[PDB]
């Protein structure tokens, strides 16, 4: 029996954050770093969608335009202030 | 003043000697896979080899 994809509901919106960046907390928990303009990083909890990709979907608590803190995460402590890369 | 030295004098175990040689540890975050710690390496290794 043949692989079949068959194809879905196609998102219009997809939070797809690197799973890099994706560090769960608390347990099982979605923790972005996305850091504001204050350039003081804040991670903000939310959770994974399903894994997709190299990245995660997130049907919650991120939204566009947000820069997401994905590595340095040992210069990196909660508040600390932070010069984005993207 | 002899005694006075004495207790003002820093001690350690033993002297450091430069080996010819050295080591550079790498760790990164939780998760991560090795082509991110191995992209590292390169980082790592170009500052030596440059």
Redesign the interface.
Known sequence: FVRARLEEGLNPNAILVPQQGVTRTPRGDATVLVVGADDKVETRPIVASQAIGDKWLVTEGLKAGDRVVISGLQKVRPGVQVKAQE | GMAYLFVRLPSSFLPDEDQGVFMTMVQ?????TQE?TQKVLNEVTHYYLT
């Open positions: 990164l975050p939780a998760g991560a991110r």
